[PDB]
Amino acid sequence: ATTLERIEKNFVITDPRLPDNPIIFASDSFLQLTEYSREEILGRNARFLQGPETDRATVRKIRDAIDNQTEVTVQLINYTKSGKKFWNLFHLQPMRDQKGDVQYFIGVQLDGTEHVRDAAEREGVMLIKKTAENIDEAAKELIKCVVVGDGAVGKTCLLISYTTNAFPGEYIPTVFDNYSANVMVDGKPVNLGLWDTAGLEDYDRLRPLSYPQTDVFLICFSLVSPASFHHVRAKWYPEVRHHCPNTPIILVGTKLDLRDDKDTIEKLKEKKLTPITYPQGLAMAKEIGAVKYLECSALTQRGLKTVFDEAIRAVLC
């Protein structure tokens, strides 16, 4: 089937398993319409589109449809980032997995200047339902990758680095967030969705909301934090396998640039520690039955593309 990026229509896909049903994919057309960036949109509920003139009764119809896991089509006023009003002929429908249970919601927007009626409304409704069907077929091939590991090991940074080629400043702990990549693999594009999760132990009861139907896990530890490495065996491997006994795991050693960093080596020496070496990482990967061991740096990007390329190959090949 076609891939998601070839659908030149306004739409988003949300994950209703996560708290508050956040957007996990947004089309380029949607970004253009709404004036928001992908990093501003993913991981958030789509209600940010609403504003002063939006009919709240219409919004409640959408809420009701989602709660009942049924499709609905409505028209309501929405707003771009800069505050420009538009009418949104909006269609929502659940996407079910092979077992028939709801996995995602698909939402399609047809923007205009007016509330359309009669013939024009009928035509609009027919168009967006067709679009939703096309997205459903394409979304069946979205690869779900979930990234787990101790707090501050660099999970978020490697996702931001891979998707924007930037490096983030201030450390801000994650709850959940999502990223999207379109990756060429053997000459064909693949849609990869990346679920970022919290390393904090106090998020243990929430974290597994991200786990169902995962295609591949990245378990991450920092090459310069032995505690994070030991937690791979004691915490992360057991947790992942408890929920997903059969899903491939890639073990990822992060912060590769710090392993040969003089200040870092000295600080570890003060702690009576040394960085984790490649053979040590590889041995841990073998111990936990990981399909690959990979090392990378979000900062320099060394090894970074290979992490996601191998994640996809673990699923497709």
Ligand X SMILES: Cc1cc2nc3c(=O)[nH]c(=O)nc-3n(C[C@H](O)[C@H](O)[C@H](O)COP(=O)(O)O)c2cc1C
Ligand Y SMILES: Nc1nc2c(ncn2[C@@H]2O[C@H](COP(=O)(O)OP(=O)(O)OP(=O)(O)O)[C@@H](O)[C@H]2O)c(=O)[nH]1
Output the DSSP codes for 22-89.
-EEEE-HHHHHHH---HHHHTTS-GGGG--TT--HHHHHHHHHHHHTT--EEEEEEEE-TT--EEEEE
Contacts (Cβ under 8 Å, ≥6 apart) of 119:
none
Smallest distance, ligand X to C-beta of residue 186, A? 31
| Segment interacting with ligand X (CB under 6 A) among 88-96, 145-153, 154-162, 254-262 | 88-96
**Euclidean distance between CA atoms 10 and 12, whole angstroms:** 7
Q: Which is nearer to ligand Y, 58 or 264 (CB)?
A: 264
DSSP-based three-state secondary structure for 100: coil
DSSP β-ladder status, 72-79 and 188-197: unpaired
The residue within the footprint of Cl ion, chosen from 21, 80, 301, 306 (CB under 5 A), is 21
21 binds ligand X (CB under 6 A): yes
Contacts (Cβ under 8 Å, ≥6 apart) of 64:
72
Task: Number of helices (H) and strands (E) in the chain: give both, helices first.
Answer: 11, 11
222 interface partner picked from ligand X, Cl ion, Mg ion, none, CB below 5 to 8 A per type:
Cl ion
**Euclidean distance between CA atoms 207 and 299, whole angstroms:** 26
14 binds Mg ion (CB under 5 A): no
21 interface partner picked from Mg ion, ligand X, ligand Y, none, CB below 5 to 8 A per type:
ligand X
DSSP-based three-state secondary structure for 231: helix
What does the binding site for ligand Y look like in residue numbers (CB under 6 A)?
Answer: 151-157, 171, 173-174, 198-199, 254-255, 257-258, 297-299
* Interface pattern 102-141 for ligand X (x via CB under 6 A): ---xxx-x--------------------------------
Contact 302, 249 (CB under 8 A): no
Q: Which is nearer to ligand Y, 41 or 157 (CB)?
A: 157
DSSP-based three-state secondary structure for 295: strand
174 interface partner picked from Cl ion, ligand X, Mg ion, none, CB below 5 to 8 A per type:
Mg ion
Q: Which is nearer to ligand X, 78 or 225 (CB)?
A: 78
The residue within the footprint of ligand X, chosen from 42, 49, 190, 251 (CB under 6 A), is 49
266 DSSP 8-state letter: H
256 binds Cl ion (CB under 5 A): yes
The residue within the footprint of Cl ion, chosen from 32, 68, 69, 300 (CB under 5 A), is 300
Residues that bind ligand X (CB under 6 A): 12, 14, 21, 45-47, 49-50, 59, 62-63, 66, 76, 78, 88, 90, 92, 105-107, 109
Residues that bind Cl ion (CB under 5 A): 21, 222, 224-225, 256-257, 297, 300, 302
